[PDB]
Design a protein around this ligand. Structure first.
Ligand SMILES: *[C@@H]1O[C@H](CO)[C@@H](O[C@@H]2O[C@H](CO)[C@@H](O)[C@H](O)[C@H]2NC(C)=O)[C@H](O)[C@H]1NC(C)=O
Ligand SMILES: *[C@@H]1O[C@H](CO)[C@@H](O)[C@H](O)[C@H]1NC(C)=O
Ligand SMILES: *[C@@H]1O[C@H](CO)[C@@H](O)[C@H](O)[C@H]1NC(C)=O
Ligand SMILES: *[C@@H]1O[C@H](CO)[C@@H](O)[C@H](O)[C@H]1NC(C)=O
Lengths: 122, 49, 50, 50, 49
């Protein structure tokens, strides 16, 4: 089970970026997809999760609108899109695997990706 | 050759029995055909001797 | 006597991969150091298992 | 004069040995051959002999 | 392991043969049930998996 993500990128403030996440070795529709970030120098912050069957996202507080979750089935690659980037968005985003149990999710993060480091600076 | 308790005598690639279970002592015995070979005759000819 | 179970979450099942499982002995014949072909009911490799 | 392949030789077996399982009890053939009543064709009886 | 089917290969020995002659079209499994003082209620709800 491998979780490879896109490479690092540098971008001026005010633009929009997209981060992909490729999964392999396991049935994608069986498990849900969770996202997590880590600003350099602090802990983990969770913005929400997206179901892999119906494709519905569920954002947390403070991440509505700017953050867009989208999936697909044939290519089977998760995407993370952020719009209107500013200086505080400089972090590394990690994909978190969570098995689908229902409307209430557990706290078992079994597999993670290598992360995608973004940096917003002038 | 240890035998699993479900299985009876085995076989080879020539569809011949090679190992068998004894029906009384429940032990494994190998089966090998005994000695055989070709017969060739040396003769100096019917004229000489 | 029969009783129906309540307070259980009715959920659809999931799928996973069967990595070369389901192989059983086809006959009661001992074989050693031989590649033997067979034609019988088997679990296909890398199949979806509920 | 020369070589000639004539026939083949083999070790004749000295005796014969018969291996049978230790069993003495007899099968009840008269139970099913001299039964009081027989089941119908659509509801045929199945009995185990072992 | 923790929560997944393991990766590997195995050969399954036969266990028993059951001559029954019946017709099978559907099947279901049997699961256990735990009842204790942490599961109050009747027999339909006072249980844990
Ligand atoms: C548990 O609930 C089921 C319904 O989900 C009951 O099913 C009965 O099913 C038969 C035929 O399958 C029907 O003729 C009956 O009318 C059903 N019962 C009812 C009350 O509708 C089942 O009986 C329930 N178990 C118990 C022990 O009552
Ligand atoms: C045997 O061989 C000799 C020559 O080597 C020949 O002269 C003779 O006739 C032969 N014998 C017979 C019976 O033919
Ligand atoms: C298993 O199911 C998934 C989705 O239901 C499908 O994408 C995949 O091709 C299936 N694999 C097999 C071997 O049937
Ligand atoms: C067994 O039952 C099913 C259920 O309808 C039926 O279709 C089938 O003909 C029966 N017999 C066999 C041999 O499967």
């Amino acid at each position: 089970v491998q979780l490879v993500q896109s490479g690092s990128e540098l971008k001026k403030p005010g633009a929009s970026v997209k981060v992909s996440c490729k999964a392999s070795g396991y049935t994608f529709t069986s498990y849900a997809m969770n996202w997590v970030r880590q600003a350099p120098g602090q802990g983990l912050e969770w913005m929400g999760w997206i179901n892999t069957n119906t494709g519905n996202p569920t954002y947390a507080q403070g991440f509505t609108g700017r953050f867009v979750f989208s999936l697909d089935t044939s290519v089977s690659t998760a995407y993370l899109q952020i719009s209107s980037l500013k200086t505080e968005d400089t972090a590394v985003y990690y994909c978190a695997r969570e098995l689908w149990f229902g409307e209430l999710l557990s706290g078992d993060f079994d597999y993670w990706g290598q992360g995608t480091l973004v940096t917003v600076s002038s | 050759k240890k035998f699993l308790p479900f299985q009876q005598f085995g076989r080879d690639i020539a569809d011949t029995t090679d190992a068998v279970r004894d029906p009384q002592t429940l032990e494994i015995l190998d089966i090998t055909p005994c000695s055989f070979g070709g017969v060739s005759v040396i003769t100096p000819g019917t004229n000489t001797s | 006597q029969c009783v129906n179970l309540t307070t259980r979450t009715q959920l659809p099942p999931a799928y996973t991969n069967s990595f070369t499982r389901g192989v059983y002995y086809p006959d009661k014949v001992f074989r050693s150091s031989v590649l033997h072909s067979t034609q019988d009911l088997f679990l296909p490799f890398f199949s979806n298992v509920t | 004069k020369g070589i000639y392949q004539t026939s083949n030789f083999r070790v004749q077996p000295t005796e014969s040995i018969v291996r049978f399982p230790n069993i003495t009890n007899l099968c009840p053939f008269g139970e099913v051959f001299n039964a009081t009543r027989f089941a119908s064709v659509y509801a045929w009886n199945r009995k185990r002999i072992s | 392991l923790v929560r997944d089917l393991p990766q590997g290969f195995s050969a399954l020995e036969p266990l028993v043969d059951l001559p029954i002659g019946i017709n099978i079209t559907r099947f279901q499994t049997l699961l256990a049930l735990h009842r204790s003082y942490l599961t109050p209620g009747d027999s339909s709800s006072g249980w844990t998996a």
